[PDB]
């Protein structure tokens, strides 16, 4: 399965989020969408939150063209799994995807950044497509954690293809960077896209998942324990 990086469209600019959905998302999905701007979320299933709990925040995501992809159910050390532990750990969030949006996703990207050759075969043979990293890092789970300013002063260096790491569990990077960010990237000239755009496969929302079954409706099995 191949690992990305960096962005080949020129112009381009991923502004991805990892571990969500959580709390501030809607707030989120809003700003982008105000400015026609993509994101590219890296979801968990049980972690910071159940994602049956957030349907109504995917739904929208994924009606609003913004990229969903796997970052596994637990947010596990991957390199330390079985394989069939880390099957285990993928297929739990595209039952998630497939129950709440009727598709499985075709893109993940390994919690801590840690993948090895089992992770990229079990990716393999569940169908996956890529295996997405980042280039640049926003530092929002820095600890000691530096401020927003500081955030948004490393933004206006980030260069054009940048594939760039946040977090949507943390409250500053909603609320202070990103609707500072969506500005100075789009004035410059950036356009920003979701991860699978920037990197010259398709933009159409529909070829970045697996269409299996209609979505379902709430039920009991909507559920985290
Ligand atoms: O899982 C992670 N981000 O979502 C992660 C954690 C530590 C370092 C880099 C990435
Ligand atoms: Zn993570």
Same mark, same amino acid.
């Given at each position: 399965?191949?690992?990305?990086?960096?962005?080949?469209?020129?112009?381009?600019?991923?502004?991805?989020?990892?571990?969500?959905?959580?709390?501030?998302?809607?707030?989120?999905?809003?700003?982008?969408?105000?400015?026609?701007?993509?994101?590219?979320?890296?979801?968990?299933?049980?972690?910071?939150?159940?994602?049956?709990?957030?349907?109504?925040?995917? %739904?929208?995501?994924?009606?609003?063209?913004?990229?969903?992809?796997?970052?596994?159910?637990?947010?596990?050390?991957?390199?330390?799994?079985?394989?069939?532990?880390?099957?285990?750990?993928?297929?739990?969030?595209?039952?998630?995807?497939?129950?709440?949006?009727?598709?499985?996703? %075709?893109?993940?990207?390994?919690?801590?950044?840690?993948?090895?050759?089992?992770?990229?075969?079990?990716?393999?043979?569940?169908?996956?497509?890529?295996?997405?990293?980042?280039?640049?890092?926003?530092?929002?789970?820095?600890?000691?954690?530096?401020?927003?300013?500081?955030?948004?002063?490393?933004?206006?260096?980030?260069?054009?293809?940048?594939?760039?790491?946040?977090?949507?569990?943390?409250?500053?990077?909603?609320?202070?960077?990103?609707?500072?960010?969506?500005?100075?990237?789009?004035?410059?000239?950036?356009?920003?896209?979701?991860?699978?755009?920037?990197?010259?496969?398709?933009?159409?929302?529909?070829?970045?998942?697996?269409?299996?079954?209609?979505?379902?409706?709430?039920?009991?099995?909507?559920?985290?324990?």
């Amino acid at each position: 399965v191949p690992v990305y990086d960096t962005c080949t469209v020129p112009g381009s600019f991923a502004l991805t989020f990892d571990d969500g959905p959580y709390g501030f998302s809607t707030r989120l999905d809003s700003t982008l969408n105000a400015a026609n701007a993509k994101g590219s979320f890296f979801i968990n299933g049980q972690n910071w939150g159940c994602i049956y709990d957030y349907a109504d925040v995917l %739904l929208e995501r994924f009606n609003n063209g913004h990229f969903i992809a796997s970052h596994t159910w637990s947010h596990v050390h991957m390199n330390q799994g079985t394989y069939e532990q880390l099957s285990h750990q993928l297929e739990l969030v595209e039952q998630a995807m497939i129950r709440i949006l009727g598709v499985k996703p %075709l893109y993940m990207r390994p919690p801590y950044g840690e993948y090895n050759d089992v992770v990229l075969q079990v990716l393999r043979d569940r169908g996956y497509k890529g295996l997405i990293m980042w280039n640049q890092d926003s530092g929002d789970t820095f600890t000691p954690t530096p401020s927003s300013a500081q955030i948004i002063d490393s933004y206006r260096s980030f260069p054009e293809k940048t594939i760039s790491l946040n977090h949507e569990i943390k409250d500053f990077t909603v609320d202070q960077v990103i609707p500072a960010v969506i500005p100075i990237l789009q004035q410059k000239g950036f356009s920003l896209q979701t991860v699978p755009e920037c990197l010259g496969l398709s933009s159409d929302p529909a070829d970045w998942y697996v269409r299996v079954q209609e979505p379902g409706t709430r039920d009991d099995s909507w559920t985290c324990e």
